Enzyme design. Sequence first.
Site, PDB file in Angstrom:
ATOM      1  N   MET B  69       1.125  -1.371  -0.452  1.00 45.85           N
ATOM      2  CA  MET B  69      -0.145   0.162  -0.234  1.00 45.85           C
ATOM      3  C   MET B  69       1.034   1.074   0.202  1.00 45.85           C
ATOM      4  SD  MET B  69      -3.205  -0.758  -0.554  1.00 45.85           S
ATOM      5  CE  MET B  69      -3.564  -1.245   0.878  1.00 45.85           C
ATOM      6  N   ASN B  95      -8.160  -1.628   6.816  1.00 42.75           N
ATOM      7  CA  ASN B  95      -7.481  -1.891   7.934  1.00 42.75           C
ATOM      8  C   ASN B  95      -5.398  -1.966   8.640  1.00 42.75           C
ATOM      9  OD1 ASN B  95      -7.725  -3.257  10.339  1.00 42.75           O
ATOM     10  ND2 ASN B  95      -6.277  -5.077   9.405  1.00 42.75           N
ATOM     11  N   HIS B  96      -5.082  -2.022   7.137  1.00 47.50           N
ATOM     12  CA  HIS B  96      -3.595  -1.662   6.696  1.00 47.50           C
ATOM     13  C   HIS B  96      -2.910  -0.352   7.926  1.00 47.50           C
ATOM     14  CE1 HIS B  96      -3.428   1.049   3.794  1.00 47.50           C
ATOM     15  NE2 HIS B  96      -5.113   0.459   3.567  1.00 47.50           N
ATOM     16  N   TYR B 159       2.105   7.508  13.847  1.00 44.96           N
ATOM     17  CA  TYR B 159       1.327   6.500  14.210  1.00 44.96           C
ATOM     18  C   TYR B 159       0.167   7.189  14.606  1.00 44.96           C
ATOM     19  CZ  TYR B 159      -2.096   2.751  15.558  1.00 44.96           C
ATOM     20  OH  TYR B 159      -3.278   2.146  15.750  1.00 44.96           O
ATOM     21  N   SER B 160       0.521   8.030  15.498  1.00 41.93           N
ATOM     22  CA  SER B 160      -0.422   9.228  16.496  1.00 41.93           C
ATOM     23  C   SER B 160      -0.959   9.836  15.155  1.00 41.93           C
ATOM     24  CB  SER B 160       0.244   9.293  17.637  1.00 41.93           C
ATOM     25  OG  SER B 160      -1.451  10.650  18.524  1.00 41.93           O
ATOM     26  N   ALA B 161      -0.280  10.362  14.453  1.00 48.25           N
ATOM     27  CA  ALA B 161      -0.617  11.416  13.173  1.00 48.25           C
ATOM     28  C   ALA B 161      -1.197  11.132  12.236  1.00 48.25           C
ATOM     29  CB  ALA B 161       0.912  12.335  13.238  1.00 48.25           C
ATOM     30  N   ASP B 195      -5.856  -8.342  20.836  1.00 50.40           N
ATOM     31  CA  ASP B 195      -4.336  -9.454  21.092  1.00 50.40           C
ATOM     32  C   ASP B 195      -4.117  -9.470  20.205  1.00 50.40           C
ATOM     33  OD1 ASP B 195      -3.757 -11.376  22.567  1.00 50.40           O
ATOM     34  OD2 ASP B 195      -4.319 -12.245  22.377  1.00 50.40           O
ATOM     35  N   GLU B 197      -0.802 -10.829  17.387  1.00 47.81           N
ATOM     36  CA  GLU B 197       0.278 -11.068  18.145  1.00 47.81           C
ATOM     37  C   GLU B 197       2.080  -9.931  17.466  1.00 47.81           C
ATOM     38  OE1 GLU B 197       3.199 -12.123  15.050  1.00 47.81           O
ATOM     39  OE2 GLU B 197       3.492 -13.986  16.110  1.00 47.81           O
ATOM     40  N   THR B 198       1.430  -8.814  16.022  1.00 42.25           N
ATOM     41  CA  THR B 198       2.158  -7.856  16.483  1.00 42.25           C
ATOM     42  C   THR B 198       2.136  -7.013  16.958  1.00 42.25           C
ATOM     43  OG1 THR B 198       1.979  -8.326  14.500  1.00 42.25           O
ATOM     44  CG2 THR B 198       2.492  -5.822  14.527  1.00 42.25           C
TER      45      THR B 198
HETATM   46  N1  LIG Z   1      -3.165  -4.340  18.171  1.00 43.16           N
HETATM   47  C1  LIG Z   1      -3.397  -3.524  18.588  1.00 43.16           C
HETATM   48  O1  LIG Z   1      -3.435  -3.179  20.017  1.00 43.16           O
HETATM   49  C2  LIG Z   1      -4.305  -2.585  17.572  1.00 43.16           C
HETATM   50  C3  LIG Z   1      -4.475  -1.995  16.325  1.00 43.16           C
HETATM   51  N2  LIG Z   1      -4.950  -1.813  15.900  1.00 43.16           N
HETATM   52  C4  LIG Z   1      -4.785  -1.120  14.560  1.00 43.16           C
HETATM   53  O2  LIG Z   1      -5.967  -2.482  13.551  1.00 43.16           O
HETATM   54  C5  LIG Z   1      -5.029  -2.578  12.446  1.00 43.16           C
HETATM   55  C6  LIG Z   1      -4.057  -4.096  12.021  1.00 43.16           C
HETATM   56  O3  LIG Z   1      -4.306  -4.599  13.107  1.00 43.16           O
HETATM   57  P1  LIG Z   1      -2.735  -5.334  13.929  1.00 43.16           P
HETATM   58  O4  LIG Z   1      -3.176  -6.663  13.900  1.00 43.16           O
HETATM   59  O5  LIG Z   1      -2.762  -4.189  15.557  1.00 43.16           O
HETATM   60  O6  LIG Z   1      -2.210  -5.068  13.160  1.00 43.16           O
HETATM   61  P2  LIG Z   1      -0.768  -6.444  12.136  1.00 43.16           P
HETATM   62  O7  LIG Z   1       0.494  -5.472  12.113  1.00 43.16           O
HETATM   63  O8  LIG Z   1      -0.967  -7.796  12.996  1.00 43.16           O
HETATM   64  O9  LIG Z   1      -1.458  -6.487  10.459  1.00 43.16           O
HETATM   65  C7  LIG Z   1      -1.163  -5.159   9.882  1.00 43.16           C
HETATM   66  C8  LIG Z   1      -2.040  -5.749   8.201  1.00 43.16           C
HETATM   67  O10 LIG Z   1      -1.411  -4.813   7.373  1.00 43.16           O
HETATM   68  C9  LIG Z   1      -0.451  -4.977   6.190  1.00 43.16           C
HETATM   69  N3  LIG Z   1       0.340  -4.778   5.910  1.00 43.16           N
HETATM   70  C10 LIG Z   1       1.903  -4.507   6.442  1.00 43.16           C
HETATM   71  N4  LIG Z   1       2.365  -3.216   6.041  1.00 43.16           N
HETATM   72  C11 LIG Z   1       2.366  -3.220   4.861  1.00 43.16           C
HETATM   73  C12 LIG Z   1       2.116  -2.717   3.803  1.00 43.16           C
HETATM   74  N5  LIG Z   1       3.411  -1.340   3.179  1.00 43.16           N
HETATM   75  N6  LIG Z   1       1.496  -2.033   2.568  1.00 43.16           N
HETATM   76  C13 LIG Z   1      -0.070  -2.990   3.124  1.00 43.16           C
HETATM   77  N7  LIG Z   1      -0.773  -3.867   3.575  1.00 43.16           N
HETATM   78  C14 LIG Z   1       1.302  -3.523   4.864  1.00 43.16           C
HETATM   79  C15 LIG Z   1      -0.364  -6.798   6.554  1.00 43.16           C
HETATM   80  O11 LIG Z   1       0.677  -7.678   5.379  1.00 43.16           O
HETATM   81  P3  LIG Z   1       1.246  -7.327   5.352  1.00 43.16           P
HETATM   82  O12 LIG Z   1       2.961  -7.957   6.814  1.00 43.16           O
HETATM   83  O13 LIG Z   1       2.005  -9.353   4.693  1.00 43.16           O
HETATM   84  O14 LIG Z   1       2.032  -6.793   3.962  1.00 43.16           O
HETATM   85  C16 LIG Z   1      -1.533  -7.353   7.491  1.00 43.16           C
HETATM   86  O15 LIG Z   1      -2.361  -7.970   6.794  1.00 43.16           O
HETATM   87  C17 LIG Z   1      -4.357  -0.998  12.085  1.00 43.16           C
HETATM   88  O16 LIG Z   1      -5.366  -0.102  10.862  1.00 43.16           O
HETATM   89  C18 LIG Z   1      -4.212  -0.411  13.350  1.00 43.16           C
HETATM   90  O17 LIG Z   1      -4.023   0.786  13.894  1.00 43.16           O
HETATM   91  C19 LIG Z   1      -5.639  -0.158  17.031  1.00 43.16           C
HETATM   92  C20 LIG Z   1      -5.439  -0.135  18.144  1.00 43.16           C
HETATM   93  C21 LIG Z   1      -4.425  -1.520  18.556  1.00 43.16           C
HETATM   94  C1  LIG Z   2      -0.099   1.679  20.137  1.00 42.68           C
HETATM   95  C2  LIG Z   2      -0.297   0.377  20.902  1.00 42.68           C
HETATM   96  C3  LIG Z   2      -0.714   0.762  22.821  1.00 42.68           C
HETATM   97  C4  LIG Z   2      -2.057   0.867  23.959  1.00 42.68           C
HETATM   98  C5  LIG Z   2      -1.407   1.401  24.410  1.00 42.68           C
HETATM   99  C6  LIG Z   2      -2.562   1.370  25.356  1.00 42.68           C
HETATM  100  C7  LIG Z   2      -2.735   2.423  26.741  1.00 42.68           C
HETATM  101  C8  LIG Z   2      -4.048   1.648  27.893  1.00 42.68           C
END
Ligand SMILES: NC(=O)C1=CN([C@@H]2O[C@H](COP(=O)(O)OP(=O)(O)OC[C@H]3O[C@@H](n4cnc5c(N)ncnc54)[C@H](OP(=O)(O)O)[C@@H]3O)[C@@H](O)[C@H]2O)C=CC1
Ligand SMILES: CCCCCCCC
Lengths: 265, 265
Positions: B69, B95-96, B159-161, B195, B197-198
């Site tokens: 992306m 969502n990416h 990220y926040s921005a 929850d 892994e990332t």
């Molecule tokens: N887990 C958490 O604590 C939280 C998650 N979120 C939100 O959830 C969403 C994703 O969830 P989460 O499971 O944590 O994230 P992950 O890092 O686990 O998943 C990210 C997804 O984005 C894709 N991705 C990574 N790099 C790129 C790129 N350069 N181009 C296109 N796609 C890409 C990955 O595929 P691939 O690596 O194969 O490209 C993957 O399928 C985000 O929008 C995030 O802000 C929000 C708050 C908390």
């Molecule tokens: C960016 C993932 C961490 C969020 C921390 C939440 C603290 C309440």
Amino acid sequence: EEFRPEMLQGKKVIVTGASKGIGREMAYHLSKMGAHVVLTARSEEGLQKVVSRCLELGAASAHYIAGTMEDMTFAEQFIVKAGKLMGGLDMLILNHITQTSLSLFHDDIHSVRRVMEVNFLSYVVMSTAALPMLKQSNGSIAVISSLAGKMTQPMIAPYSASKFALDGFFSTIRTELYITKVNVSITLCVLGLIDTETAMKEISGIINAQASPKEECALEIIKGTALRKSEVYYDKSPLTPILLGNPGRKIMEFFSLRYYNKDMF
Amino acid sequence: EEFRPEMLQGKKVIVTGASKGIGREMAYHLSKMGAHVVLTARSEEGLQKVVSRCLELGAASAHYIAGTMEDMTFAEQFIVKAGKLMGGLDMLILNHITQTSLSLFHDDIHSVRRVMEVNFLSYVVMSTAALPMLKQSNGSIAVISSLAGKMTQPMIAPYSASKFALDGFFSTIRTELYITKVNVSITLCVLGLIDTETAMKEISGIINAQASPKEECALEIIKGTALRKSEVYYDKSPLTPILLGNPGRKIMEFFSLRYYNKDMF
Ligand SMILES: NC(=O)C1=CN([C@@H]2O[C@H](COP(=O)(O)OP(=O)(O)OC[C@H]3O[C@@H](n4cnc5c(N)ncnc54)[C@H](OP(=O)(O)O)[C@@H]3O)[C@@H](O)[C@H]2O)C=CC1
Ligand SMILES: CCCCCCCC
Ligand SMILES: NC(=O)C1=CN([C@@H]2O[C@H](COP(=O)(O)OP(=O)(O)OC[C@H]3O[C@@H](n4cnc5c(N)ncnc54)[C@H](OP(=O)(O)O)[C@@H]3O)[C@@H](O)[C@H]2O)C=CC1
Ligand SMILES: CCCCCCCC
């Protein structure tokens, strides 16, 4: 703590977008307070007029460096040059933006990128380059935003996105500086409609709201930043600061820190 | 109105960042409900595993198109191809996210640009490219955000921005769709610590907090978007939605519309 124009006497200040509008007004006020100032914008002709007016007003020193903030290398080098010219930096006022026109968003992704580049990226670049000197003088940074950076209104999605981004980034920086005990303050300035000829021209036939005087606005920005306040609201309605202040967010931010491993900072 | 899985039966849905995390869980949920789905991410191998699991789960159809992306052309063309493949579009789930690790900001300007590019720009590119199809089916758009998109916490300035920027851009788009009478809904999903892994790996030793289950999180996003809610909050504390809801902002936005010339809509 109350403001006194003495607080800016001798200070080294940079002001972007100082060719006109709020920027030019801040240059004048800083000048009347006996501050050292370095201005920037695109037009050299426009900067020369304001720089002249600045000494004529009492500026302890006045200089300009024309250029476009679309160029990150120029933005970066601008800061260091300004720093050399004044031998330091006490206050950085990020005020410039790119030409914005009101219209329902259609497409034009290249326009959105230019907006995020000039309105947001150039600010992080300049603040980053200016931090070293700012740490030496325990200086301050004023980030000019607007109501559109705290709330949403139609026809300015790109601009709005860039101002929201500014709050997100700089609010994080503010707390990081504070958390690592670095005495550099960040003041986000939330401005309502100001009577600059650019603004008035742009909302003509679209927005009805009353505008506030650009001169007083410029003053309040100087005051709040010198007083190291986190946020400064300036709008005709006295309800704006209370309705956009977001006390809920302040509560969440305070409690959020308790989850961090204090050894990280 | 209450949710019923049947609301997605036969719906044509796109899900980005689907190779893992919450994106993958959303794919599995849309599948069990009998929806048509086309997923994307960088890992071709990873996408393969999920699309296969989707068919087993009962998807009306399932396809994947690997790519980055960071490429705005791949982003806009991914939407056109996916649309052709399903013969339309009912729901777009952005969502990416690009990679980011917790760390006090310093001077990584290329990272900031990359983050804004992936986390924000690609989102407007895809929503722009997908809007025509969404207008025909009166579809929906889900833009995944986080608490960090409504409040501030240290070590995630970039990220926040990008998350704040999404709120500013899409809340504007949402209100613009509404005043022009276009029936396409925009749901901003504000997620607490999930929850995945990332996430768990990235906060290790830095942030010690309780996370919510990724499966339930995915289900709430879908239910919320299906119900056309403007915002969805998913977090441990029942106080989070109240504290971050910003009612003051909603009031300001309502009053500000009054100053606009309705002919422009
Ligand atoms: N887990 C958490 O604590 C939280 C998650 N979120 C939100 O959830 C969403 C994703 O969830 P989460 O499971 O944590 O994230 P992950 O890092 O686990 O998943 C990210 C997804 O984005 C894709 N991705 C990574 N790099 C790129 C790129 N350069 N181009 C296109 N796609 C890409 C990955 O595929 P691939 O690596 O194969 O490209 C993957 O399928 C985000 O929008 C995030 O802000 C929000 C708050 C908390
Ligand atoms: C960016 C993932 C961490 C969020 C921390 C939440 C603290 C309440
Ligand atoms: N006026 C209003 O109603 C409101 C204003 N604000 C905020 O106030 C600040 C200034 O606003 P305002 O006085 O109205 O704006 P102006 O358009 O009057 O001033 C913009 C300044 O930026 C400079 N500039 C423009 N484009 C570029 C570029 N590519 N690179 C470098 N410099 C550039 C201009 O000089 P030049 O064109 O010669 O380069 C000028 O001196 C902004 O941060 C804005 O968002 C907030 C709310 C309301
Ligand atoms: C371009 C910003 C215009 C602000 C108008 C809303 C008045 C409260």
